[PDB]
């Protein structure tokens, strides 16, 4: 249980690294509704998620097991697929970052 949570920090650190930075940058900080002009984001997305919030929740003790961590990382991607159109640039970036997460998260 304790060993799994330490590995979860390693997955988040890889996602934050310069290697994946080209498609991981719109997921670093929370979705800015006022700056981008996304008036209906809070209406459609009920539970918003970002890499900084997952990092903060992990830095504390919000997740009991790795499954709770995974559910939050998958929520971040699910929010991107629900709100944005299927042909948007951020959707393709979410798929590439999910490919990185799913590969490392499965190997534990
Ligand atoms: C209209 C798309 O807006 C978003 C919806 C969404 O679901 N996500 C996860 C992110 C963004 C998003 C948020 C920020 N700015 S921010 O400070 O909030 C985060 C750094 C910056 C870019 C963002 O996306 C893109 C927008 C245009 C483009 F050409 C490619 C993009 F990738």
Query: 45 with 82: CB under 8 angstroms?
Result: yes
Domain 1-108 has CATH 1.20.1260.60: no
* Contact status, residue 97 vs residue 23, Cβ threshold 8 Å: yes
Say which experimental method was used. X-ray
Atom of ligand 1 minimally distant from the CA of 83: 7
Resolution in A: 2.4
**In sequence order, which ranges of the chain are alpha helices (DSSP H)?**
2-16, 21-24, 33-36, 41-44, 51-59, 66-83, 89-106
- For residues 60 and 39, give the distance between their C-alpha atoms in angstroms, rounded to a whole number: 31
What residues does each domain of the chain span? 1-108
Q: Is the minimum distance from the CB of 48 to ligand 1 under 6 angstroms?
A: no
Distance CA 91, CA 93 (A): 5
Give the three-state DSSP class for 45.
Answer: coil
The span from the CA of 41 to the CA of 57, in Å, is 22
Residues 6+ apart with CB under 8 A from 26: 90, 93
Rounded to the nearest 10 degrees, what angle do helices 66-83 and 2-16 cross at?
A: 30
Contacts of 72 (CB under 8 A, 6+ apart): 49, 53, 54, 57, 63
Instruction: Specify whether the CB–CB gap between 72 and 47 falls below 8 A.
Output: no
Q: From the CB of 77, is ligand 1 less than 6 Å away?
A: no
For the Cβ of 89 lying below 6 angstroms from any atom of ligand 1, the answer is yes
Under DSSP, the state recorded for 87 is: T
């Amino acid at each position: 249980h304790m060993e799994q949570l330490k590995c979860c920090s390693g997955i988040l650190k890889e996602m934050f690294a310069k290697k994946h930075a080209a498609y991981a940058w719109p997921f670093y900080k929370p979705v800015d509704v006022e700056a981008l002009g996304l008036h209906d984001y809070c209406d459609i997305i009920k539970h918003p998620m970002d890499m900084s919030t997952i990092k903060s929740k992990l830095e504390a003790r919000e997740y009991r097991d790795a499954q709770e961590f995974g559910a939050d990382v998958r929520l971040m991607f699910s929010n991107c697929y629900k709100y944005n159109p299927p042909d948007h640039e951020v959707v393709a970036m979410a798929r590439k970052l999910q490919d990185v997460f799913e590969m490392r998260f499965a190997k534990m």
